[PDB]
Amino acid sequence: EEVETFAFQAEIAQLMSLIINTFYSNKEIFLRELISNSSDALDKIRYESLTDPSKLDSGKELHINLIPNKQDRTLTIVDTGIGMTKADLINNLGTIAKSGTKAFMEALQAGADISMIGQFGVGFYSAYLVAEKVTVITKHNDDEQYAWESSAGGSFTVRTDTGEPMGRGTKVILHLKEDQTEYLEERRIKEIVKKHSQFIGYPITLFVE
Numbered sequence: 781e782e783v784e785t786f787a788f789q790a791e792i793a794q795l796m797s798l799i800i801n802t803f804y805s806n807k808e809i810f811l812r813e814l815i816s817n818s819s820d821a822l823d824k825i826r827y828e829s830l831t832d833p834s835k836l837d838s839g840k841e842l843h844i845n846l847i848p849n850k851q852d853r854t855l856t857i858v859d860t861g862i863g864m865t866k867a868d869l870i871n872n873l874g875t876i877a878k879s880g881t882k883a884f885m886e887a888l889q890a891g892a893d894i895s896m897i898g899q900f901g902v903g904f905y906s907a908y909l910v911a912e913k914v915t916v917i918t919k920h921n922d923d924e925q926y927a928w929e930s931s932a933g934g935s936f937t938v939r940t941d942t943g944e945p946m947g948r949g950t951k952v953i954l955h956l957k958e959d960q961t962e963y964l965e966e967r968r969i970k971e972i973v974k975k976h977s978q979f980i981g982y983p984i985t986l987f988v989e
């Protein structure tokens with residue numbers, strides 16, 4: 781398969797290095813960030829449904845699924861949101877994050893906490909607090925299925941997903957660090973969801989193993 785490799789923009793690469801090497805025990809914030817991104821993707825496609833009703837022909841249900849898998853050591857966050865095009869993954873996410881990183885890093889020096897990352901539109905990268913590798917499968921109405929991947933280290937890869945079609949939405953697969961397996965435990969996910977995502981306007985299903 782034709783795998784394309786891209787360098788992260790200097791600011792994002794730096795933010796990712798900050799997230800990976802900074803001593804910070806309150807790692808559970810990653811979940812709230814990912815669910816908050818999923819809720820936004822669901823708001824975007826729910827808004828599109830009003831003007832044009834044909835955009836829902838790739839799945840009518842607007843929901844969030846939390847899928848732990850102890851065998852694979854993965855925590856998957858699935859949404860039936862707007863999804864991303866190839867341009868979204870390469871250019872659009874790169875430029876929105878470029879401005880976000882600068883705003884957040886200046887705020888960190890001005891008294892802000894790492895838990896305030898989401899206010900800068902870079903909440904996604906908090907995934908690297910618990911994950912050694914992140915794989916993103918995405919499908920937008922105006923494009924094909926793409927798989928994005930990064931183990932940080934300054935690069936990401938993009939390829940056309942030859943795997944299982946998902947219709948529309950985004951699947952964030954967190955390949956958890958060795959010492960971060962508590963995020964595969966039902967009671968731990970439940971407690972995090974109740975504490976930080978108690979008022980999300982879409983159903984959140986926690987899968988059992």
Ligand SMILES: CNCc1ccccc1-c1ccc2nc(N)nc(C(=O)N3Cc4ccccc4C3)c2c1
Nearest residue numbers: 817818821859862863864868872873904916928950
């Ligand atoms: C702002 N939303 C609209 C938008 C406009 C331009 C570009 C994309 C999007 C878009 C659409 C659907 C989304 N759905 C989910 N669940 N998450 C995100 C997200 O913020 N991500 C950050 C990120 C970084 C690296 C790889 C992957 C990701 C994913 C999404 C982003």
